[PDB]
Structure 1
Amino acid sequence: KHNMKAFLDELKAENIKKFLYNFTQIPHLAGTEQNFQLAKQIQSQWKEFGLDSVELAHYDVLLSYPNKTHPNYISIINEDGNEIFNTSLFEPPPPGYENVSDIVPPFSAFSPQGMPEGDLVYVNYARTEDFFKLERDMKINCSGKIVIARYGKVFRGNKVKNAQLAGAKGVILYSDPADYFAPGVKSYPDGWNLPGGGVQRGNILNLNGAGDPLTPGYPANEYAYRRGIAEAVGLPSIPVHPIGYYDAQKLLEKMGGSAPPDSSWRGSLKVPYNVGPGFTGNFSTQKVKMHIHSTNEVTRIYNVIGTLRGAVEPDRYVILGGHRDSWVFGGIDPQSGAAVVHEIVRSFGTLKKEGWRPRRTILFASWDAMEFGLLGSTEWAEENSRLLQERGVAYINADSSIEGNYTLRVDCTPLMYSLVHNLTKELKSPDEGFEGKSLYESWTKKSPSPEFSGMPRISKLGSGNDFEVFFQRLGIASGRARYTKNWETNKFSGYPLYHSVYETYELVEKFYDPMFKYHLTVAQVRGGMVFELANSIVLPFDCRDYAVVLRKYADKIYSISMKHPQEMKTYSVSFDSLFSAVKNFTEIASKFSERLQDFDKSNPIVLRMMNDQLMFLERAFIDPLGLPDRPFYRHVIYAPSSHNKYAGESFPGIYDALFDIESKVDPSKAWGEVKRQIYVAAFTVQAAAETLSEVA
């Protein structure tokens, strides 16, 4: 038979390993020839694998690169202006790659050029609360200072935004061993830890969903009319550069001024972690100088778009997408995910060659320029927004398949919770000690849901990955899954060698997944989800699961507001309308579910009506006016946190209206805006509910 089991059984660990090796021998930086070559290779292979059509979709977008003949670096300069200490110009290449060309040196993409020199202030992780603590509690002024922040906890773009608004004239990011060196594990190449010379690359934009900085709203095609740089979206105004902890140590060791306010401010280096500003007495006349000469330039990028036409509903699209561009070799990020996508295409293509086709169309995407701001997926979705919004069933992302070897991690819309539960109950656990048990069982045991015994944790979607346009802009149900670490063991924001030259094929093959069994489990979950979404007669979404979480989020936002009981009385702030809408959603969804079970199974119009109702339910949470000052975040239930693009926030409009409200100078105005956001959320919830009522 051609069923899900045939699909799953065709997937092979050994194929994923071969593809990963193939994709990670040279760098594939967005906009470079090497990445265009790989694009053409994957196009060719997807065609040979059997897809009906495979095309490149190219765009001309703003990227950023260091100047090869004018290196970025930071100095300590003495009062004479002699540079007495200089940070590294490159990471020491790993064994056997010391002759690889075109390894981009560490840099912060989209930094402006400049050579600011000043006194250092240490700002911990540069989170909103870290700046609050500096200004409000410690009375330290960052205006005109160079800020040094440790990576971790939040997206680095938010750090840079926060430093700018504090008045910093430059930012230095570094990786502290506290956050990127797991105790008892060796540095690469002998373990999976970050060495003192390792550095995390990465962009520092604040795009808020816009895509290419020059063309917000519209694809960066041949004839596009670009904004000038001064009106581009999301560019930082101060120079920024990342360094490793050997170099960080040499910048921090001299710091004077105030002590760190508490231990949550101290990392693991042998330094006091003084906040500054500036250096202790003997060194007080020395300063820090950055030298940044990177350039922004419009550069062509290439997405690969594969189509497997549906047999019955070709005008319904289930999309499996993940990026192909990497900072250097991309051993984990993204090629561990791209190798999984490749094998999924291969497997679906095998069935197709034997005469099968999915019920609905499957689109496969190899996105470009993700590392420079989700540019490739966003431009493509801008180009294709009307097809995607009227035909898009679901989007399954496929970045890094592994970031650990402990258990599964899934973030998705509530509409996919039941699908994920049911699919994982069918799959075999790859975990030691769970031989012959289901993935559901191992996952639930290692990662229990905080709410419900006997179920696993599934998180909301955040951002910083290629689902952002499809979910928070366009309202297409989205999900993602990968293998991850035990967050109780270390609690780091990622894996140590993230975005470093040390992220290699050997990293994965030797330390993360020698038998490629976690990769295979991830291919089964991602591929399985796509299979069911594209082949189930009734779409596999359970609207009742949205009702349950909407109540949890309404409770949560209410509890936040209820910290201000006097203001709620003064300004008559009521959540009654939101709870009412949620109650109605619960009731209507329950009735819809009965019809879906009970409808006449011979009637394809009733079926498609109810599949359209299922498909357009995520779509109903979109507000076409967007959230305040973030027009490309239109989903009213979920947006990326305004303080950390990686994290999702629920009822974001209300949350941001309530955030730090006790500090606003005009409370009447501030609480007015809370009430406005309550109204918008209540209305959108009720409106979404009504899409599930009988249609006439």
Structure 2
Amino acid sequence: RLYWDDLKRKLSEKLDSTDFTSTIKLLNENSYVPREAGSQKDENLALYVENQFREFKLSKVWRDQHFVKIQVKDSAQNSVIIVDKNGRLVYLVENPGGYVAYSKAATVTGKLVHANFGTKKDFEDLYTPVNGSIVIVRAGKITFAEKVANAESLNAIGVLIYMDQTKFPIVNAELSFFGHAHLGTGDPYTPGFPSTQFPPSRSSGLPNIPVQTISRAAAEKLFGNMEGDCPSDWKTDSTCRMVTSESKNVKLTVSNVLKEIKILNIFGVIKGFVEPDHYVVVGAQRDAWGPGAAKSGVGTALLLKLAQMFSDMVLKDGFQPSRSIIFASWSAGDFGSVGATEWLEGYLSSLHLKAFTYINLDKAVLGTSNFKVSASPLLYTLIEKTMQNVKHPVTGQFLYQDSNWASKVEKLTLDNAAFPFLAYSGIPAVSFCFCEDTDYPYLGTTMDTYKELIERIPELNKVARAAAEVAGQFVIKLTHDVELNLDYERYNSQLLSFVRDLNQYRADIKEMGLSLQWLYSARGDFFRATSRLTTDFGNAEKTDRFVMKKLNDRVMRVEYHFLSPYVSPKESPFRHVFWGSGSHTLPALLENLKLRKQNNGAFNETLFRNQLALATWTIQGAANALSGDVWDI
């Protein structure tokens, strides 16, 4: 067993002589260049990664194979067409190079209406009714899946998406791009039974309208046939317009088809010396529509180098992780973390007893200016201590520069592979990156190349190196300390913050005959439960692996006990009342209640009483799950 100081030094010095850019460049070679999930090139890289793991001599390397239905574009072209309502003659504007996976295959003709980013707010602020019209929106702010849903929610009949030059200062205006519009993760077409025969989807999260990505040039050509200046508030090109002329409307034809593919998740593992049946999981997306250097290459490179380093530290330098470290190369990430989700779904309710943390490595390097982090609050302390002794690659200062960084942390979103881990599986998760206030413009394009990457970021090797150090320090701390570096006390602030918000309606809870007393008591009981647990840790003999096991297991279950037990994972997979999606999340409870100031019928008093109940029960249950022995109350 080594000292944390030595492990820190060892990791750092191994990192010093590590060549990241070579690997990123290597992954950008023609053997791997265009690696859409399931393709032979994806399969090539999968084989290469797998071989590398074998050369690193990890305890065991294996395959997690899955068959899934994705959507690819048909031999028939998707098309964007302008129609003259006079005589109904059509003019072809574009056959897009790209497409949007999970779009309804359909042909729709209507008026075209701009809706900015297609955010929920953008739609309400519209002075043009979207109903029965095709909508065009800029990429960014929110996922394609959300834009489609918001629009579909207002009865739009189709969606176009372009990259405006203000948000995406790309010289080539003919660039086409890719994404998906499945409002979830995993395979949307997952019949619980094999079939020839065709069953409907139900609560799939799939679009019922066609959605399609277009080049900025094609959008500006559409603007050429539209009227109305865009609000300066949108801060967009002067090109932009709002609505088709009276005599014209647009026709969209999407003919994407379902294809079944064989994806491979490639796994390596360094077994733990004390509790090998518990693991930290480190993963990266291996697939990409185009070259996907930043989208896929960076992550896969870090995955490979981290795996190599840790294998060397165990075999040469005497590092002895208490718990196991699993390295995961995912496929079909581009379709909604499909690879990751399929694997997660094998262990719906059991995984949280083995995996205590997931570290995502996707898009860790996109810029230089900033260091962003999204994570479970359970990892805020680990993250903080890690930023306090990792240096900025350009700047030289420690990453930790703001004592208040934790309150400004944004939550994991659906397009992040870290999301299903936290919100569906109840495993604390963290994603982080070096970046700007600007999205990396080339993501999802054929311009996401190494050359492009090394050009916007000439210090690529140093920056990737800093990204590896944070992930590496995470992984060491997590498998070295006898306690788990999961700060369960953090959820007191979260509950406090939530009740603090809720208490801004102590009046409206009166006019409904409701007391919030049982909820306050749940919050109090959780506080007590954490306090007792901290005391127990302090009074425990750190060398007694039996008592630590027992205390650590309690910590490992905190996250999962915030998954609502009162909703089916099939109907709503994202059960986490803090971080998931649906009417069972604390945020939903607040939004339903904010709709009570308006005397409009949007408020749903009944729903709220149920939400209040389920929240209280969930929180009580978590407090009770943490308290320990049934005679201690």
Structure 2 residue 54 is the aligned partner of structure 1 residue 47: yes
SS of equivalent to 2:137: strand
SS of equivalent to 1:333: helix
Per the alignment, residue 685 of structure 1 pairs with 619
CA RMSD of aligned residues (A): 2.7
- Cα deviation, residue 176, structure 1: 1.5
How far apart, CA to CA, are the structure 2 residues paired with 1:369 and 1:628? 21
Cα contact 1:463–1:640 (8 A) shared by 2: no
Structure 2 residue 176 is the aligned partner of structure 1 residue 199: yes
Cα contact 1:214–1:227 (8 A) shared by 2: no
SS of equivalent to 2:433: strand
Which amino acid is 2:44 matched to? Q
Which amino acid is 2:625 matched to? T
> Which stretches in structure 1 are left out of the alignment for 5+ residues?
90-104, 182-186, 189-194, 452-456, 643-648
TM-score (norm 2): 0.91
Structure 2 residue 179 is the aligned partner of structure 1 residue 179: no
Cα contact 1:571–1:672 (8 A) shared by 2: no
- Cα deviation, residue 378, structure 1: 0.7
Per the alignment, residue 673 of structure 1 pairs with 607
How far apart, CA to CA, are the structure 1 residues paired with 2:447 and 2:12? 32
Residues 402-438 of structure 1, C-alpha deviations (whole Å, 9 max, x = no match): 2221121111111111111112222233232xx3x42
Per the alignment, residue 320 of structure 1 pairs with 282
Per the alignment, residue 76 of structure 1 pairs with 82
Residues 589-644 of structure 1, C-alpha deviations (whole Å, 9 max, x = no match): 123212212322332221111111111111211223338995211112222589xx
The partner residue of 1:214 within 189, 196, 200 is: 189
Per the alignment, residue 592 of structure 1 pairs with 533
Structure 2 residue 106 is the aligned partner of structure 1 residue 114: yes
In the superposition, relative to structure 1, how do residues 324 and 343 fare at CA in structure 2: closer, same or farther (>3 Å)?
Answer: same
How far apart, CA to CA, are the structure 1 residues paired with 2:341 and 2:197? 17
Per the alignment, residue 335 of structure 2 pairs with 372
The partner residue of 1:230 within 170, 192, 200 is: 200
Cα contact 1:627–1:636 (8 A) shared by 2: no
In the superposition, relative to structure 1, how do residues 650 and 480 fare at CA in structure 2: closer, same or farther (>3 Å)?
Answer: farther
Per the alignment, residue 581 of structure 1 pairs with 522
Identity %: 26
> Which stretches in structure 2 are left out of the alignment for 5+ residues?
none
- Cα deviation, residue 377, structure 1: 0.5
Per the alignment, residue 430 of structure 2 pairs with 479
Residues 333-370 of structure 1, C-alpha deviations (whole Å, 9 max, x = no match): 12211211111001011123225441111111111111
Structure 2 residue 282 is the aligned partner of structure 1 residue 341: no
Per the alignment, residue 346 of structure 2 pairs with 383
Per the alignment, residue 540 of structure 1 pairs with 485
How far apart, CA to CA, are the structure 1 residues paired with 2:614 and 2:350? 27
Please list, as runs of the form range in 1=range in 2, the aligned pairs for 1:221-370 lying within 5 A after superposition: 224=194, 228=198, 230-231=200-201, 233-256=204-227, 260=230, 262-265=231-234, 267-271=236-240, 273-274=241-242, 276=243, 278-279=244-245, 284-354=246-316, 356-370=319-333
Cα contact 1:8–1:528 (8 A) shared by 2: no
In the superposition, relative to structure 1, how do residues 72 and 518 fare at CA in structure 2: closer, same or farther (>3 Å)?
Answer: same
SS of equivalent to 2:489: helix
Cα contact 1:625–1:631 (8 A) shared by 2: no
Residues 130-175 of structure 1, C-alpha deviations (whole Å, 9 max, x = no match): 22233xxx3x433322111122221111111122222222211111
Cα contact 1:215–1:224 (8 A) shared by 2: no
Per the alignment, residue 94 of structure 1 pairs with none
Structure 2 residue 32 is the aligned partner of structure 1 residue 23: no
Per the alignment, residue 392 of structure 1 pairs with 355
Cα contact 1:329–1:504 (8 A) shared by 2: yes
Per the alignment, residue 554 of structure 1 pairs with 499
SS of equivalent to 1:482: strand
The partner residue of 1:438 within 393, 398, 407 is: 398
Please list, as runs of the form range in 1=range in 2, the aligned pairs for 1:128-207 lying within 5 A after superposition: 128-134=120-126, 138=127, 140-181=128-169, 187=170, 195-207=172-184
Per the alignment, residue 645 of structure 1 pairs with none
Q: Could you tell which deviates more after superposition, 374-383 or 9-18?
A: 9-18
SS of equivalent to 2:509: helix
In the superposition, relative to structure 1, how do residues 628 and 346 fare at CA in structure 2: closer, same or farther (>3 Å)?
Answer: closer
Q: Could you tell which deviates more after superposition, 11-20 or 388-397?
A: 11-20
Which amino acid is 2:214 matched to? I
In the superposition, relative to structure 1, how do residues 304 and 673 fare at CA in structure 2: closer, same or farther (>3 Å)?
Answer: same
SS of equivalent to 1:569: coil
Cα contact 2:112–2:250 (8 A) shared by 1: yes
- Cα deviation, residue 115, structure 1: 2.7
Cα contact 1:199–1:243 (8 A) shared by 2: yes
- Cα deviation, residue 399, structure 1: 0.6
Which amino acid is 1:691 matched to? A
SS of equivalent to 2:329: strand
How many residues align structurally? Answer: 620
SS of equivalent to 2:63: strand
SS of equivalent to 1:319: strand
Structure 2 residue 405 is the aligned partner of structure 1 residue 449: yes
The partner residue of 1:38 within 45, 59, 64 is: 45
SS of equivalent to 1:298: strand
In the superposition, relative to structure 1, how do residues 245 and 29 fare at CA in structure 2: closer, same or farther (>3 Å)?
Answer: same
How far apart, CA to CA, are the structure 2 residues paired with 1:568 and 1:392? 40
Cα contact 2:80–2:250 (8 A) shared by 1: yes
Cα contact 1:29–1:326 (8 A) shared by 2: yes
In the superposition, relative to structure 1, how do residues 116 and 390 fare at CA in structure 2: closer, same or farther (>3 Å)?
Answer: same
Cα contact 1:64–1:297 (8 A) shared by 2: yes
Structure 2 residue 26 is the aligned partner of structure 1 residue 56: no
Cα contact 1:175–1:245 (8 A) shared by 2: yes
Q: Could you tell which deviates more after superposition, 244-253 or 33-42?
A: 244-253
TM-score (norm 1): 0.83
Residues 623-681 of structure 1, C-alpha deviations (whole Å, 9 max, x = no match): 23338995211112222589xxxxxx9723413533645679767x8122212212222
In the superposition, relative to structure 1, how do residues 407 and 555 fare at CA in structure 2: closer, same or farther (>3 Å)?
Answer: same
SS of equivalent to 1:231: coil
How far apart, CA to CA, are the structure 1 residues paired with 2:376 and 2:435? 19
Cα contact 2:565–2:618 (8 A) shared by 1: no
How far apart, CA to CA, are the structure 2 residues paired with 1:556 and 1:304? 44
How far apart, CA to CA, are the structure 2 residues paired with 1:310 and 1:671? 51
Per the alignment, residue 415 of structure 1 pairs with 378
Per the alignment, residue 191 of structure 1 pairs with none
